[PDB]
Point group: C8
Chain length 191, copies 8
């Protein structure tokens, strides 16, 4: 509900592809497969491929890609403005992927789905079953991001590990935001 | 509720047939027949025939199809602009079917209805009835997309297979979106 | 709730009689009599007579029917434009009945009320009472479209047959829409 | 709730007395007396006298009734336009009563209150008390339109007869609408 | 809730004192004292004195009462227009009391509070206590319009008599409306 | 909820201090102390001192009180207009106190808090404890306006006396309104 | 909810710092520490320091404090207007603190938190524990303003003392308002 | 809910980065890890790094940082206005971090997460386990800010310590606000 709330707040306060990516995330049914084999793949895919598609889309929506390919295709184009126009296009296009990554990291769903089956959750596993094959722990830990599937509360506290992984995800998200802001500052200060 | 939410978000942010197809999907009562004989037919039909109707409709709503058929009908028309006008009409018309397919794939209802009776769900079938005729499994698996009909929780976990098939559907949807975006990029870069 | 939702969406997106028929359907209390003698009559009547009334109404609301009857009544009218004006009036009037039929077919209430008592529901009738007089089955099947009246769950699963008949109705509705769109395409391409 | 919904839809789509009558019906507390002596009187009265009052009101709100009575009162008026003006006034006034009758017939409350005590409900009366004095059946059937008063479910199924009478009322309403539309068509085509 | 609904509908459709009286009734906490001595007084008072106050208020809000009293006070006023102005003022002022009376009669609260203790409710009194002093019946019948006070369901059915008295009140209200409309028609047709 | 409803209705229909006093009452947390010593004081205070403060405030908000005190302070002011200006100021200021008193009387909270401990409630006191010291009745009757404190239902029916006192309060309120309207009529008719 | 209601009413009716202070109070999470040592400190602090901060803020937001300090700093400023400008600034700034104090006194939360542990609540303490060390009563009375902490209903009725202290707070608030209004009247009448 | 309420109130009343930080806090899912090792780190991080990022962002969004770095980079710039422009930029940028810190201190979530495991809560620890190793108390106290994890109500009252720490946080927040306002007053009065 917080994501939809901030969506409405951004709409009220309101370059546009940022809101598009935010809305698409807030209205995308993230469903972790909750299986030890496809958890990592699904999480990393949701993290990686939507920003790639947003990058391509931002390139396509640009009204002057045709002139770029026309000049790049000719031997002697009717040239410097070309590099500048291409850099401007790339910079305008890179906004939506960054917004998507930041949003999906602050909301640690992809991180929880991806890193649950293999993470080291030893402070959460009950003291009784503290000696059992990690292959048995694989399925149980993989079922963690699923509320309606995880029916083994006697072995692992679900919320206790959920909060831990979500905090790690939020830390990674803030680190990403800081690095991106530093790079943007350097770019705006040099070029 | 997510589909209606994104519908309202698209309305707020707001060529028009895209919103028409999105609204028609969000307000269409998808009812899987939940029978081993008509599941596949119904799913594939909901996937296939609505985009065909949208294609035809987009052709009909075009204001200058009459001039196209008039020129194609004459031996010597009062011609090149004809191919260009036809290509432009087709490109404008192809938008709504793609939006419909993308929406109905991201929301894996048609996929779940179509591929449930014949898919290989062996990790979900209970260990007790792990040796029984696939003809008996046919009806049970066909009843999966129906919440109020599937009353055999002792044989197959419904949600566990629902998430699996829905994840496969979302993967197919993202693949479709990527391919369509690549084709659109090539088209806008060449012609 | 889906019908009212699409009504509001159409109002937001917004020749006018289409919305009138949609609203009138979404606000009409369809009550199947749930009797073996009047089910068919009521269903077919709700399917047939409202579009006839809409046709007549669309003819009446037309501002230039008076000139049409004046010219048709005279021996030598002060004539060709007459056939064209009449065809245009008929084409404008035929919109609301088609919208009504499409809506009431996509929402398989009339179909369920009409075809329930005589349809062949043998895969749904319980295995115990699989040998009983069809005259006894008549009343039970007729009571199917009534949630608060059908109190014989031990003989027929209500939802299982409801979904089946509703799917058949939706198939018929899509077929009707496709045929109508093809005819409209031919008309706009020829005349 | 359907009546209020269509009221709001009519307000959104929006000679005016039609909406006035619709609103007055949707906000009028219809209370059937549920007594064998006053049921018929109350139902027929709600059906008959409100349209008469609407007719009189529409005559009163007309701004040029004074000139009509002035000319009708004089021996030689300062005359043909008189008949035309009177006919136009009557036609404008006759709209609200028709709307009231149509609405109160489509919503079979008046019909249910009026015809319940004397109708022949023999397929609904339980098989046990299938032989008892019609004088005893009078009170029971009269109590049918009252949900909070009818406490004799062991003798007559309330909903089963309610649906039957309401279907009859809706049939009568559609017949009335068709006849009125035919008359309006003839009037607009002749005069 | 119906009164507030029609209040909002009147506000949307929207000489002004009519809406004022309607709003004041819909927001006035009618509390029947439910005592055999003050029931009649309270009901008749709520019926009678608010329209008197509305009449006086409508006279006061009139901007030209000062000139009326100035001319009526002088021996030879600087006269015919006086009678006309006074009649116009009275006619404009008489609107709000009529609206108040009509509203409070259609909503049979005042009638129920006033006429419950002395009315003849013999078909509703239980057959067991069908022979008891009317002085004992006085308190019980007086407690009828109070839902949270009437705790003698074994002697009189509350809803059965409530509907009866409310129907009588609605009949009286419709009679009042018809008489008022006839008088208004005669006035507008003569003067 | 009725007070807030009429507040919103007044806002929609919309000299201004009247709405200010109405809003302040509808948003003021009236808390009767429910003690035999402070009940009367609190009720009469809520009835009396807020209108005094409103009177003073209306005098202060007046933009030309400075000229009034300047002229009243001088021996020979640069005089008749003074009496008229002062009377106009007083008449404009007297509106809000009257509105406050009328509102707080129609909503018999202050009356109930003030007159409960000493009123004669003998028809409501149970027949068992019909002979006990009035000093014991003092606390019980004082606790009447408190729903969550009055825990002696076996001695006095709370709602039965609440309705009685509230009806008396509403009678007093209507009397006050009538007297005020008569005085206003006389003032507007003389001066 | 009453505070937010009056906030919305003030916003609808709508020098500005008054609404700012009202909003800040209605959206400030008042949490009494419910300890015998910090109750008084917290209550008096919430009563005292926010108006001081509002005073300072109103001084800072003033656009011409710089000229004031510039002239006060110079030996011979390029002087009388200085005293007038300073008085006007102070008078404009003193509004928000008064509004804050009035609001937080009418809503007797600070008073209840501050004066509960040491007040004399002897009519509320149960008759059984009417003889016990005031040191034991200290903690119990301090826990009074906390609904979820006060678990000693057998010793003191919580609501009975809450209403008493809240009534005292409202009396103090009305006294403050009257004194402030009198001072404002004198100021506007003299200077 | 109070934070969102004040967000909406600020939006209605409505340099812009203040609302941005407020919205971002009200829509940020604060999740305390509830572990004795990461509690302090997470709390202090949420308190410290978001204002740093807001500072950097406010520097980046400034349209004339490029001219600043251009002049600072040159040996002899085409200089005094430089220091003034830089000071103005820094002052404009310092607003959002202060708003973030004030908001997150008034809402004592970060303080509660950070200082719970090591604070001295001896008046809240039950009298039975008043003698146990502080290492055992570490985990229990760390679990305090988690409602769904703290399942040791027999050792420490959760709400009693929550209110205490939240009150300390609010005191610190008000102190911070006072110091910031004093510094702003001095700055606006000197420079
Ligand atoms: C740990 O397991 C034991 C039994 O093996 C059970 O009683 C206990 O509740 C479990 N505790 C947790 C925290 O899982
Ligand atoms: C599997 O079947 C057994 C009995 O055949 C039943 O007790 C158990 O609950 C079932 N488990 C699942 C996951 O279906
Ligand atoms: C079929 O009938 C038997 C008894 O005749 C009953 O126990 C069973 O539940 C019924 N099943 C269905 C699906 O109607
Ligand atoms: C009919 O009456 C019998 C007893 O007389 C009762 O058991 C049965 O439920 C009733 N059925 C209906 C449909 O009223
Ligand atoms: C009538 O009274 C009898 C006992 O006197 C009671 O059993 C019955 O329920 C009552 N019926 C009504 C309708 O009050
Ligand atoms: C009156 O008191 C008796 C016992 O003293 C009790 O049983 C009865 O319910 C009470 N009635 C009322 C109306 O208080
Ligand atoms: C007073 O205390 C007694 C026992 O000490 C208890 O039974 C009673 O309910 C208490 N009453 C109040 C009002 O606290
Ligand atoms: C303190 O502990 C005892 C048992 O050790 C328990 O009965 C009591 O409820 C506890 N009280 C609190 C306030 O934790």
């Amino acid at each position: 509900r917080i994501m939809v709330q901030f969506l409405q707040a951004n709409q009220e306060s309101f370059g546009i592809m940022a809101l598009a990516s935010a809305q698409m995330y807030s209205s995308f049914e993230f469903t972790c497969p909750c299986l030890p084999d496809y958890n990592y793949a699904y999480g990393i895919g949701i993290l990686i491929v939507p920003p790639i598609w947003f990058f391509l889309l931002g390139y396509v929506m640009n009204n002057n890609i045709s002139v770029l390919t026309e000049e790049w295709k000719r031997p002697v184009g009717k040239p410097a403005v070309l590099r500048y126009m291409f850099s401007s296009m790339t910079q305008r296009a890179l906004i939506a992927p960054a917004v998507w990554i930041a949003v999906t990291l602050m909301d640690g769903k992809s991180f929880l789905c991806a890193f649950s089956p293999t993470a080291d959750l030893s402070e959460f596993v009950n003291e009784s079953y503290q000696s059992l094959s990690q292959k048995e722990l694989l399925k149980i830990q993989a079922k963690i991001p699923c509320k309606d599937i995880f029916e083994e509360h006697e072995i692992i506290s679900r919320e206790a590990a959920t909060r831990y992984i979500r905090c790690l995800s939020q830390a990674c998200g803030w680190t990403f935001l800081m690095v991106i802001t530093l790079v943007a500052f350097l770019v705006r200060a040099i070029r």
